[PDB]
Structure 1
Amino acid sequence: EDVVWRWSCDNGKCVKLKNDPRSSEPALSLEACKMFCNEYGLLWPRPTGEADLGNFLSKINLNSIEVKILKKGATDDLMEAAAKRFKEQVSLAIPRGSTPKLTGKAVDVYLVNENPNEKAFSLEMDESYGLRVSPSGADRVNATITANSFFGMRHGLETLSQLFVFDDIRDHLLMVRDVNISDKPVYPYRGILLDTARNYYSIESIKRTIEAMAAVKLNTFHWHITDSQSFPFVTTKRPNLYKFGALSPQKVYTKAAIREVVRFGLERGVRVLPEFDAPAHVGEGWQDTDLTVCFKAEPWKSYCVEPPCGQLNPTKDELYQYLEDIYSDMAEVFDTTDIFHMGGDEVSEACWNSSDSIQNFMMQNRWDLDKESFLKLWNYFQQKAQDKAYKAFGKKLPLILWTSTLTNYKHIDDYLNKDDYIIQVWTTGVDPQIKGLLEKGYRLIMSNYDALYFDCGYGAWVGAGNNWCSPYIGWQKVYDNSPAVIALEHRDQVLGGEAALWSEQSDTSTLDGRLWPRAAALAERLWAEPATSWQDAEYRMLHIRERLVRMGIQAESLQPEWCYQNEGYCYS
């Protein structure tokens, strides 16, 4: 039947009131009230420059939206695909099973790409855009997006699609009448790390993730594609790695599958960045090569962070022929990435010290087993691995490693340099290492485990109780975690941040809930770096969740829907 309520803006809150028949005042639907009652309406993330939404809405004919590309170039296929995708994005305003009346104004969307040949990902890429909406003649609307690149342009199409509201009282599709928006991201790297080796993720679910990412202007999918537990990456040059390493023959990522994901990402402004974690976090797949040590070592607690144990043996020269092949196969299909992630997860010293061949190698090279020594070995490995990586990608490109014993700012310069290596940070924002690194000129990606480890909070997967980094991190906590606060003056060295979904307790089935809507909080934090806190974003956060659900994302629930319909009554 019929919606019986209406909403009215009062002190920044949409108040639910009965829609009494004996009134000369036109009733506002919930979303229509929200669009103007809220500082930023229904936008997520909120823009950084001009945020002028005006005061009024106009009724729109859903069938009379036409997109026009004004400057042609090398990104024609991308712009054309992005344009075709736009009506789908608009239809997200309409709840499922509801149908809008096909009446109202016609919409002309004008796409102005000022450098139509650019399609490369880079930390220096221009993601800026200008959005202007205004009436055109008597029966139409002029929506004009102006951007320095395709990437800024498709961001603009995303923001534009958010300026449509469905009036479920009247069954009208509406649109903000007078818009002036100018927008650019604070940070160039806005990412999600997806571990697809601790458990497998269907490529369908990976694509779905990219869709949700594009919806909130996240631009980097970090594909942690290998680890101790499995090797799903299809390497044509070393096929036994995935034949022996995959969880099953179907649980693999073929060249065709990866090319699909990479293209799907590109179309949506998402860089697909591969990781080969080494020399720790290796195991399954390497059987019969004699290139690992400690695989399945027992008791595991003595040799590694989590079962199964296993590490590369850096004293075998054949190892680097394998790596060269793995990296080359990666470079072939991950062909949009401008960066390579090489892991650098904490190496076990006990694991390396328990191998004869390694101990013999260190005797001949004048190194003792004192642990300045084992750091020497790790550096020896990384240097050789690095060399292979460059050969594989056919150029010097930036490389990422995690904060670890190797990347301790005190000695980091012995090994790496700040121009060649970006450091991904898992430590808390108040850890000394961050200041130490930033002073030495290093660039950072923030993944502090107290605010950005999206796996935290669930039951133990070894023994009983809860998992190691519990409690569960609410979106409030991810929203307030500010790299600018963490880095201070050195904030230009912060490239951005990344929500990490480690997968010992996540797979295809849990992926939507794990990431959404929490990764949206990161999305806004990194796009806008607002000085305001989470409570000022709360109402819009509740709307973005509903939007993901409309997309078919099984997003986590934040609050009773009653709270969304009754702003201000749910507080503490």
Structure 2
Amino acid sequence: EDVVWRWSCDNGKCVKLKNDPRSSEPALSLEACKMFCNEYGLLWPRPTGEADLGNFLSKINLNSIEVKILKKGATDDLMEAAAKRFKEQVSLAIPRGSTPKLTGKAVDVYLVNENPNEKAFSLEMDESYGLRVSPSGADRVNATITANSFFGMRHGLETLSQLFVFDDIRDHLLMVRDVNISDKPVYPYRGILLDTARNYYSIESIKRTIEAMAAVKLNTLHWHITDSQSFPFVTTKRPNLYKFGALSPQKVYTKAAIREVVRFGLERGVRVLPEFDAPAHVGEGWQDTDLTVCFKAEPWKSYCVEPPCGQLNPTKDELYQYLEDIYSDMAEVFDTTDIFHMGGDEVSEACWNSSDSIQNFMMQNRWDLDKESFLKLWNYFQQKAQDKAYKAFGKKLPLILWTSTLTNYKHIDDYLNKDDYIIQVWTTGVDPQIKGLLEKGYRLIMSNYDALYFDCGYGAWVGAGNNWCSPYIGWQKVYDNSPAVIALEHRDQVLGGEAALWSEQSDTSTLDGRLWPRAAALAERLWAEPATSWQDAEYRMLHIRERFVRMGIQAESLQPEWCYQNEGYCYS
């Protein structure tokens, strides 16, 4: 039936009041009130530069929006696809089952791509844009997006679509009348790590994830595509790896499917970054090669962090022929990435020390069997693996490794160097390793497990209780986790951050709820690095959750919808 309430801005809060008929004041719908009661309206993330939204809305004819590309170039196909997606972006303002009256002004969207040939991902790419909205004549709106590249331009299309509101009191589609926005991200690497080896994720759910990432301007999908539990990556050159390693014949990622995901990501400004974790985190798929040790070793607690155990045997020269083929097959289909993630997760010495051939190998080279020697074996592996990666990608390119024994800042320079290796950080923001790494010039990606491990909090998956990194991390905590605070003067060496969805307790069915809307908190933290805390983003965070749901994302619920309609009454 008919909406009964209206909202009125009062000290930054939209107050619900009855829509009394005996009033000469025009009623405000909830989101129309929110657009101007809130400092940044309904925007997420909030812009970093100019953020002038004016004071008025204009009624818009949904069928009279037209996008015009003013500069043509190599990104013509990308710009056209982004333009065609803009109307459905706009329709996200309308609740499902509601239809706007097809009246109001016409909208002209002018896209100005000032370097229309640029379309490569790089840490130095220009994601900035300018957004202007103003009345054009009497019956039209002029929205002009100006950006130095396609990626900044499609960010601006995202922000523009957030400047529409549905008046459900009147069934009118509205748009902010006078807008001056300039915007650019604080960090170039704004990512989500998706583990698709501890459990399988449908390609459809991966594309859905990329959709939601683009909606909040995240730009990197780190595809943790192999691990001990499964090998779903279809490597044409070593087919037994996925044939033996896959959980099932249908639970694989073919070349065609990965190409689909990579293209889907490029069109939305998302770099699809593959990882082959090595030399630990291997197992399924390597049967009958004699290239691993400790696979399914028992008791697993004595040999690895979680079952099944298993590590590569770096003393077998055939291993690096396998690795070169894997990396080459990855480079063929992951052909938008400028970076390669090589894992580097903590190696088990007990696993390597229990091997006949490994100990004989270490005798012959004057190595003992102490802790320092197995670190030397790990360095031996990473050097040879790194060479195959360069040959596979046909060029030197940045490589990522996790913080580990190998990348301890006290000895990381022994074989790594800060120009070839980026370090992904799981330690807490107060761990001394971060300061030690930054002073040695290393670049960092923050994935602090106390704020950015999105798998924490659920039940145990071995034994009873809860999983290892519980409690569950609320969005308030991931919002307040600031890399700038963590890095201090070395801020420029922080490339950004990444929410990690490890998947021993997550798959296709839980993907939406694990990531959303919590990854939006990381999106604003990395895009804007606000000096304000989560309380000042709370109202806009509640709205972006609703926008995710309108997109079809099964996003987690944060608060009673009553709180969303009654700002200021839910606090502590």
The aligned residue for residue 238 of structure 2 is 238
Shift of 1:156: 0.1
Shift of 1:410: 0.2
Deviation per CA, 1:469-510, whole angstroms, max 9, x where unpaired?
A: 000000000000000000000000000000000000000000
Deviation per CA, 1:22-70, whole angstroms, max 9, x where unpaired?
A: 0000000000000000000000000000000000000000000000000
Shift of 1:91: 0.2
Deviation per CA, 1:380-419, whole angstroms, max 9, x where unpaired?
A: 0000000000000000000000000000000000020000
Deviation per CA, 1:169-208, whole angstroms, max 9, x where unpaired?
A: 0000000000000000000000000000000000000000
Deviation per CA, 1:62-83, whole angstroms, max 9, x where unpaired?
A: 0000000000000000000000
Distance 1:387 1:213 in 2: 33
Deviation per CA, 1:316-339, whole angstroms, max 9, x where unpaired?
A: 000000000000000000000000
Distance 1:393 1:85 in 2: 32
SS in 2 for 1:537: helix
Distance 1:351 1:198 in 2: 20
The aligned residue for residue 216 of structure 2 is 216
SS in 1 for 2:395: coil
**TM-score w.r.t. structure 2 length?**
1.00
Structure 2: tracts of 5 or more residues without a match: none
Distance 1:114 1:17 in 2: 48
The aligned residue for residue 385 of structure 2 is 385
Distance 2:20 2:266 in 1: 50
SS in 1 for 2:142: strand
Distance 1:449 1:301 in 2: 22
Deviation per CA, 1:500-541, whole angstroms, max 9, x where unpaired?
A: 000000000000000000000000000000000000000000
Distance 1:363 1:440 in 2: 33
The aligned residue for residue 84 of structure 1 is 84
Distance 1:415 1:293 in 2: 25
Distance 2:65 2:415 in 1: 57
Shift of 1:151: 0.1
Distance 1:45 1:344 in 2: 32
Shift of 1:162: 0.0
Shift of 1:222: 0.1
Shift of 1:441: 0.1
SS in 1 for 2:8: strand
The aligned residue for residue 287 of structure 1 is 287
Distance 1:59 1:114 in 2: 31
Shift of 1:256: 0.1
Shift of 1:135: 0.1
Distance 1:2 1:274 in 2: 50
Distance 1:354 1:502 in 2: 28
The aligned residue for residue 533 of structure 1 is 533
Distance 1:310 1:465 in 2: 26
Distance 2:516 2:369 in 1: 46
Structure 2 residue 112 is the aligned partner of structure 1 residue 112: yes
Distance 1:217 1:159 in 2: 9
Distance 2:369 2:457 in 1: 38
Distance 1:520 1:301 in 2: 36
Deviation per CA, 1:240-284, whole angstroms, max 9, x where unpaired?
A: 000000000000000000000000000000000000000000000
Shift of 1:357: 0.1
Distance 1:303 1:318 in 2: 24
Distance 2:230 2:491 in 1: 37
Distance 2:252 2:370 in 1: 40
Structure 2 residue 58 is the aligned partner of structure 1 residue 51: no
Shift of 1:434: 0.1
Shift of 1:360: 0.1
Shift of 1:561: 0.1
Distance 2:366 2:526 in 1: 47
The aligned residue for residue 35 of structure 2 is 35
Distance 1:491 1:351 in 2: 38
SS in 1 for 2:317: coil
SS in 1 for 2:288: coil
SS in 2 for 1:138: coil
Distance 1:359 1:26 in 2: 82
Distance 1:111 1:255 in 2: 33
Q: Report how many aligned residue pairs link the two structures.
A: 572
Shift of 1:211: 0.1
Deviation per CA, 1:419-469, whole angstroms, max 9, x where unpaired?
A: 000000000000000000000000000000000000000000000000000
Distance 2:304 2:292 in 1: 14
Identity of aligned residues (%): 100
Distance 2:515 2:533 in 1: 21
Distance 2:171 2:292 in 1: 64
SS in 2 for 1:25: coil
Distance 2:230 2:128 in 1: 40
Shift of 1:371: 1.2
The aligned residue for residue 440 of structure 1 is 440
Deviation per CA, 1:522-566, whole angstroms, max 9, x where unpaired?
A: 000000000000000000000000000000000000000000000
Structure 2 residue 416 is the aligned partner of structure 1 residue 422: no
Distance 2:211 2:296 in 1: 38
Shift of 1:115: 0.1
Structure 2 residue 403 is the aligned partner of structure 1 residue 403: yes
Distance 2:104 2:405 in 1: 63
Shift of 1:153: 0.1
The aligned residue for residue 256 of structure 2 is 256
Distance 2:438 2:341 in 1: 20
Shift of 1:352: 0.3
Distance 1:427 1:344 in 2: 14
Distance 2:437 2:159 in 1: 36
Distance 1:418 1:335 in 2: 24
Distance 1:237 1:499 in 2: 32
Distance 1:491 1:379 in 2: 29
SS in 2 for 1:308: coil
Distance 2:307 2:29 in 1: 54
Deviation per CA, 1:104-131, whole angstroms, max 9, x where unpaired?
A: 0000000000000000000000000000
Distance 1:10 1:515 in 2: 33
Distance 2:345 2:153 in 1: 37
Shift of 1:229: 0.1
Shift of 1:84: 0.1
Distance 1:362 1:15 in 2: 73
Shift of 1:219: 0.1
Shift of 1:221: 0.1
SS in 2 for 1:547: helix
Distance 2:503 2:4 in 1: 45
SS in 2 for 1:372: helix
Task: Write out aligned runs for 1:83-102 (5 A).
Answer: 83-102=83-102
Distance 2:7 2:128 in 1: 35
Distance 1:352 1:213 in 2: 39
Distance 1:39 1:489 in 2: 29
Distance 2:306 2:491 in 1: 34
Distance 2:457 2:415 in 1: 36
Distance 2:87 2:349 in 1: 56
Distance 2:15 2:33 in 1: 9
Distance 1:164 1:204 in 2: 28
Distance 1:315 1:134 in 2: 67
Distance 2:110 2:386 in 1: 45
Distance 1:372 1:415 in 2: 14
Distance 1:460 1:210 in 2: 29
